[PDB]
Amino acid sequence: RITLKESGPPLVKPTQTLTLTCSFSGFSLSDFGVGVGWIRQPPGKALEWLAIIYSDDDKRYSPSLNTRLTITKDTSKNQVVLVMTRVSPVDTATYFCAHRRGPTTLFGVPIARGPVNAMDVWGQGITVTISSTSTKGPSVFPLAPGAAAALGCLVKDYFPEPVTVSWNSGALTSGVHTFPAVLQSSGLYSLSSVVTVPSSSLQTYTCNVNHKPSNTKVDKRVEPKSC
Amino acid sequence: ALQLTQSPSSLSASVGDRITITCRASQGVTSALAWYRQKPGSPPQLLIYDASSLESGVPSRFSGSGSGTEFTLTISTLRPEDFATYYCQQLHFYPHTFGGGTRVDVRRTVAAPSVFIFPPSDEQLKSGTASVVCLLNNFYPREAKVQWKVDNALQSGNSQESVTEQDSKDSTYSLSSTLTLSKADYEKHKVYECEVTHQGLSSPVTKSFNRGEC
């Protein structure tokens, strides 16, 4: 059984250097033709290939990132390290390392190369966020209005993830939509949480927001304005 | 470099259907192509290697064929765990490219979004910033287009949006879009509009308000 696992800092600041380690078990980077590669996935985006290293020590890099990447192996520790320099916000992504089989051998003679055509086992992935922001609590603002009515709370400018939002201390669940946060160009996150109700219920509505990282709890009652 | 284009980018289906996803390469990659299935929150999982070989432990409903520039993955009888995003990967040329992915989600009746526009709170305005949010609630299919207009000027580069994951009961999606402006710019205009295009809407719907109107 082959397993891989990524480790490194979850948070990194722009211009800094990011070092990611892939520790694995079940194979050796001294086994014939084996490879270990790195692939990343920005939130909501496609997979992007970064680099790979083989047991005979040949190395290859994405041409778009070549100047900022270094991949190396430590055979005796069963680890592969990928160093990315000068990171910027667009480098925020989940980073995965993965195993690549070498050709099948028969009495130590390569006879099948078809198994090298895939990365067959992957690590769970490690989430890395690139932002210069310091820990900071959100500002919470009201969002106020088939014949459904909508209202919500805009949880703005906080760092880092995550934040939790519930409605009426947990009693309001139907019609609730809490959207995934977006990382603003400022380096702070922002999210909305809304709830749809029969245009008659306008019943009281309060969003309970909690950002553990900054010890910031806020309850904000939201109503249909006009005094 | 080498381009790998997946089709379709998104696909709706129901348990029991037969689906086929295709991947085309800009130059021939021989048989060096792999297919993966990735479920939300998890790493991609290898299904098919070397264009058509079934990876060990992978269920037989998955099949891959093709070589050169055109490949296909077909799942013969879709199971609930197959609602996910699929990717193809080329390993003939460096860099070892991935396709853009194809999202497979639960099919249901087209449903237009209920649209709502929210002006910025007076509380936010006092801090000097103005957020205008637009909500597209419970729609299907997933593709929707939001266009912000301020006093009829088309907005660009000053909004951000996020979409919820498919609802497990509804099978619909919801989308939130935030237009952000300084309090000053905000004050220099009156009509804030959120224009929405979607398959379930005969023509675009616009929700708006005039700033300061009391």
């Binding site: 490879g35 | 060096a32 040329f93 460096y94």
Partner: peptide, 7 residues
């Protein structure tokens, strides 16, 4: 350029 195990 061509992959390592190239065709």
């Amino acid at each position: 350029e061509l992959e390592k195990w190239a065709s």
